Design an enzyme around this catalytic site. Sequence first.
Site, mmCIF file in Angstrom:
data_model
loop_
_atom_site.group_PDB
_atom_site.id
_atom_site.type_symbol
_atom_site.label_atom_id
_atom_site.label_comp_id
_atom_site.label_asym_id
_atom_site.label_seq_id
_atom_site.Cartn_x
_atom_site.Cartn_y
_atom_site.Cartn_z
ATOM 1 N N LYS E 163 0.895 -1.006 0.083
ATOM 2 C CA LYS E 163 -0.107 0.087 0.039
ATOM 3 C C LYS E 163 0.796 1.365 0.046
ATOM 4 O O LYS E 163 0.446 2.478 -0.901
ATOM 5 C CB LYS E 163 -0.557 0.178 0.901
ATOM 6 N N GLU E 189 -3.592 9.542 11.930
ATOM 7 C CA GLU E 189 -2.303 8.952 11.554
ATOM 8 C C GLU E 189 -1.569 8.110 13.271
ATOM 9 O O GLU E 189 -1.095 9.597 13.784
ATOM 10 C CB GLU E 189 -1.239 9.911 10.648
ATOM 11 N N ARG E 190 -1.524 7.495 13.363
ATOM 12 C CA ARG E 190 -0.298 6.615 14.204
ATOM 13 C C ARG E 190 1.309 7.535 13.947
ATOM 14 O O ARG E 190 1.833 7.783 12.908
ATOM 15 C CB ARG E 190 -0.460 5.112 14.220
#
Lengths: 500, 59, 179, 53, 481
Positions: E163, E189-190
């Site tokens: 991805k 977002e981590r």
Amino acid sequence: RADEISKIIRERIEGYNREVKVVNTGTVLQVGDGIARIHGLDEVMAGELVEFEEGTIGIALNLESNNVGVVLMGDGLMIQEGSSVKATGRIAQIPVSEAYLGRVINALAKPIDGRGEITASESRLIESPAPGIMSRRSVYEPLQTGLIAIDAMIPVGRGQRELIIGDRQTGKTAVATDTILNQQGQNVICVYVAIGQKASSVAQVVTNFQERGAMEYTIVVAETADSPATLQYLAPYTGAALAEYFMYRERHTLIIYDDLSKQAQAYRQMSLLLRRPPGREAYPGDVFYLHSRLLERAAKLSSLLGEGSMTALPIVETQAGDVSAYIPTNVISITDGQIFLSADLFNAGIRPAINVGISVSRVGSAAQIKAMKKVAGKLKLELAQFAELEAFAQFASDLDKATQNQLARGQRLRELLKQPQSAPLTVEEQVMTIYTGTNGYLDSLELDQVRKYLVELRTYVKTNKPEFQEIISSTKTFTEEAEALLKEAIQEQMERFLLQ
Amino acid sequence: YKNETIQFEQQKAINQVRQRVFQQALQGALGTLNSCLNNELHLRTINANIGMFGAMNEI
Amino acid sequence: DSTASRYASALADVADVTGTLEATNSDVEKLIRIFSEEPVYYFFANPVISIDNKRSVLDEIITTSGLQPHTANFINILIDSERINLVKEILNEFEDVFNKITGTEVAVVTSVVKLENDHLAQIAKGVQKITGAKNVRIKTVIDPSLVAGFTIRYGNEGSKLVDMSVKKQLEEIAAQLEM
Amino acid sequence: LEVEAKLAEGRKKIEVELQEALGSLEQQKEDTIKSLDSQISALSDDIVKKVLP
Amino acid sequence: EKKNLGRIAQIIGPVLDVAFPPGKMPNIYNALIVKGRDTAGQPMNVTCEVQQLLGNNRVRAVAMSATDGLTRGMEVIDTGAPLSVPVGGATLGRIFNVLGEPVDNLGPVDTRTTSPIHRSAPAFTQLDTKLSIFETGIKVVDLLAPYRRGGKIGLFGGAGVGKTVLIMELINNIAKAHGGVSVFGGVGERTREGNDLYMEMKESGVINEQNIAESKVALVYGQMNEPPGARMRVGLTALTMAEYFRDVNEQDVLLFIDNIFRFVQAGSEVSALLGRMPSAVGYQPTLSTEMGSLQERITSTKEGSITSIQAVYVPADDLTDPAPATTFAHLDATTVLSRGLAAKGIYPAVDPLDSTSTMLQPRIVGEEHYEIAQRVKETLQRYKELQDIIAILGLDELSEEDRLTVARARKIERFLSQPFFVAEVFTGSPGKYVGLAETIRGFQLILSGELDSLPEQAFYLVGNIDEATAKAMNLEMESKL
Ligand SMILES: Nc1ncnc2c1ncn2[C@@H]1O[C@H](COP(=O)(O)OP(=O)(O)OP(=O)(O)O)[C@@H](O)[C@H]1O
Ligand SMILES: Nc1ncnc2c1ncn2[C@@H]1O[C@H](COP(=O)(O)OP(=O)(O)O)[C@@H](O)[C@H]1O
């Protein structure tokens, strides 16, 4: 012992130089259900500890137009409806030092084991911000959990936040305790946060720790289910603050949040009691913010801030395996990977009942040593082929020989992923176990013999061929010399076990 | 561990002695404050706290 | 805010726009005890009583007590829109908005005995300097619940506070408990 | 069986090792509190002189 | 914009109430900074957005930052504009939060141009009505699931399939092939994944670290550590940065969003905090309007075109849930990423049959392209049905038409691979760009019997079928030698 009191009373009578200061003050309007709506504190800040007339201390959470609804960190029994609340101007700190190792504490970092008092000189806020993008690194260091099935299939790295999600009584606390026991050789400061647990359960856990000798590098934060909702809400944050102290002082830590869903329930209780608008399952709109602010503190620092890390291992209980529930979906979206447990696999014998096919690890093979990847690839491929052919087991007789081989290799690779409680394998032992199984030096044995033969082989190799352990440990790779030594030891133990 | 437990009982006993001593001392302190002449005592200490409150207004 | 706040501020604003602030303060301190003594408060409450039989006796009370006409208009509107059940709360909340508009911060000095007023005017000076209040209406209560001296609650209701009668020995207890 | 007997021996040892020190400490703190009761009256005075100028 | 000073009246979580002078209060969707005070001993300001006017000189805001340590009576500064973020080439190769502040610690960005994130879409007259085909240069995506210029594309691949390498290849290809730029918007977002992504973008040459502003991407990060106000508006910040590159510079912009489900999730969170009654499955009542006000600014005007590639998460794996069901009312195409194809090394791991597209129609792509793509789909589907029979009987006990079908299908399945410019850094192969014309000319030859006397490992990991014939000749030289 007769003049020490005189000296200390002179010291404490002359230390205080008669200081005056302006203080925010308010009067209680209504106290009930652990909430006290108090009128007057028009200068208090959100999240600030306020002390009551009777000694209780609370946290000002919602600051309305008329009053300041505070949550009580205790029982509001002696609150008076007219007593004066004095704001302190402090925001929820804990005293923190390296003197917490070997101690069990509650959500105020105070002893409950009754072994004295922790002399802590520094201090840290309970809700402290997470490390940003630049103060982080990439997770590469392995975190050995001792369970071979996790270490090979769903690997955990130092600085990863991995979710032990499962049903009730499937082995989640067992997995966390196996990891904490396995951290003996490595210098990892472990933290166990018992949120809303039964007090005798925490007593059993801490006595197991002391018996196995894992109490010397562990801190246990216990807030049992008789606690107010505020203390069960604050406990994982004190755990994270202690582990953050140790992390920022260039050390590697590990924190286990036992039933993060219990903290979500405590926060839901206090949010509903503060008359806040509910959402799905009556959870407030910022319970995702609750869990994410806490889990994002688990970082691997940036090698200029000190290379230290904090590995979060939260536990979440699903009901009827409904993973589409609100809190499990939140913590799954937040965490790096998941380690699913199954009551079907648990009752079916396989312990720890890890569901490898549905567990993920978004760090991946970067959390393994170079020795582990070589056997892990073959183990993963062969286990995938077994998962494919699992339906053909009832018709194993009318199949191709290659298919029968894949089926037998699968049902004796499943047998080496079984483990007993509190017996964590080192990385060399599991390297040799996975190698033996995945090559096929036990493709001839019966299913009631694989576990016994592997136990005898592991003890034999550890006792007789320490060159293998040394080459796996110092070079951290699966060398050709290790391969040859392991084949020799396999043949020798095969003869000695064919002797029976 | 058990020797540490005994030492904890030691320190808690020290603390409870200090507590009851200071409670009796507070009884005695209110007692000796009952004898002082309230008018001159107030004319003195209220003005002392007046100077202190001016200092407070500066800080 | 509240209904009390939103009505008290309205009356104080229509008292500011046509300067009668002392006349309206006298009017509200009269109306506070005129609407105390629960027979009359109940009578202007008790919604079964008709608004005409209310308004008659109300205009009588207007004529006798000689009140300003716009405060009388305010009470007529409180009869009109059924907020007369909160007339006690409106009248008691009027004082805070009157002191906000008139630049005053009211600051109790709760001491044991009567003060000699030179240091009391000193406390007035201090509370007015520290808050920007133009003319503090300091009040005191003879309350022997203290130990030695005085203390002052100023700000909004009693929000800020400095305490020197007992807080010394309170800190001594906090030292002796040592936790 | 014999290490269970040793596990039992630990308890026989702990009862004495705690209760004797405990009795010593109880009587010591009692003597120290009733001894100070003659002196706490005088020791109250410095607090008075500290709080009032 | 002036001395319009407010005072905080309520602090209930991340939702504030501000009181104002009687004539001057901000409009809805208006930024206001809270001149707050840190307990440590320094001042620190908090940005909020007006959501509702409440009556007597009082609004209700939602904080973009945390509200801990805020008192009632802090000075709130009305700003007269929506959230204003920096725009232009100054925002390239840098990381931004929802407020347009840099968080990559490289230094400050010059606010020479600031656009508001709350803006109406292009007009019905200014819209472009043409159906163009965005060309990514990737064989499988261009042939079987074509992209639209000005449309949205849903990534459905799970964790661990190619991805991130795919979106980096899309960035590099829109920079090198066309004159376009890219804007990554990380909704939820981590933080460690954000750092890993930024490092890999520095390494893959996408973010030129030796010289910023030569870069091909602008990063906006709304993280999970942040309150639900920031995580909701970070997509609008990213869309504004992309809309500047469309409007002023007239480029073909590529707007990457992370999970658009977390956009919906942050929206439902802020609606639960503001107290509105929930919608059907508990989502916000303004679900479709909240989604559309975002997705309608991803269009193609007469100047440029924004094409969005949004990762889509389906809760409980059903496409009838309101967040997937309302996202799919805007998707023009769809690429699914295969765990099995990533396993057997068919990177890029796009599933050829499960990836759909509404661009694949004769009127839009030519009858030639449509017919060859349908024939490739039929061939791969027949092979997928025939794998079990080949496992039982074998290729010999099949028929002749089925055997040639199976061989052509293995060759096609290996031809859907590609060596990537950004995956070269660990694989080594020089990486190829394959336009659509060479794709369809190569698949015509691999499907009609013109290239059947070749090994299956000759079409694998090449582009541009001439390279397949050349590697075939080399693999035959390996035999002659
Ligand atoms: N690997 C294992 N081998 C043998 N027994 C195990 C193993 N793991 C767990 N058990 C047994 O399963 C039981 C439950 O274990 P555990 O407490 O870890 O589950 P849990 O999910 O924490 O329970 P709860 O849902 O009540 O929190 C215990 O009796 C334990 O002995
Ligand atoms: N075109 C390619 N060629 C070779 N390897 C690839 C290619 N695409 C992906 N990979 C490998 O597959 C893995 C996919 O990981 P990645 O897509 O970064 O995970 P995520 O989707 O979680 O970001 C990468 O580690 C990469 O090495």
